[PDB]
Design a binder for this molecule. Sequence first.
Ligand code: HEC
Ligand SMILES: [Zn+2]
Ligand SMILES: [Zn+2]
Ligand SMILES: [Zn+2]
Ligand SMILES: [Zn+2]
Ligand SMILES: [Zn+2]
Ligand SMILES: [Zn+2]
Ligand SMILES: [Zn+2]
Ligand SMILES: [Zn+2]
Ligand SMILES: [Zn+2]
Ligand SMILES: [Zn+2]
Ligand SMILES: [Zn+2]
Length: 82
Amino acid sequence: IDGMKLFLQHCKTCHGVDGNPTDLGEGLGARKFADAEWQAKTSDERIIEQINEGTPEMMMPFKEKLTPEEVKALVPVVRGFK
Ligand code: HEC
Ligand SMILES: [Zn+2]
Ligand SMILES: [Zn+2]
Ligand SMILES: [Zn+2]
Ligand SMILES: [Zn+2]
Ligand SMILES: [Zn+2]
Ligand SMILES: [Zn+2]
Ligand SMILES: [Zn+2]
Ligand SMILES: [Zn+2]
Ligand SMILES: [Zn+2]
Ligand SMILES: [Zn+2]
Ligand SMILES: [Zn+2]
């Protein structure tokens, strides 16, 4: 499982690789991942739940597209470690 490959396939269109939302992402309500305060206050579980369930009118759920292993592999990408 390549976490970054999954991110480029499924997430990049709203959350850019640099840790900054795209124009589309920001319009829907996304904020920066590249933020020390956000990273410090956000648990892995919150990240996993967000990928799994999304947010109505903002982010689609990915639970029916990705396995728990694949969702977990995305955590160190969101964290900025690749
Ligand atoms: C645009 C249609 C999006 C795609 C594709 C992905 N995400 Fe997203 N995400 C989007 C918005 C508008 C928001 C804000 C909504 C909210 O309730 O916070 C988000 C949010 C996140 C978060 C934040 C959770 C938190 O508690 O702050 C994470 C960690 C996140 N999104 C990750 C993520 C991943 C890994 C994706 C690919 C599988 C992905 N998102 C797709 C918009 C969009
Ligand atoms: Zn890679
Ligand atoms: Zn895929
Ligand atoms: Zn997709
Ligand atoms: Zn980002
Ligand atoms: Zn802005
Ligand atoms: Zn900050
Ligand atoms: Zn962690
Ligand atoms: Zn819990
Ligand atoms: Zn709990
Ligand atoms: Zn919750
Ligand atoms: Zn939310």
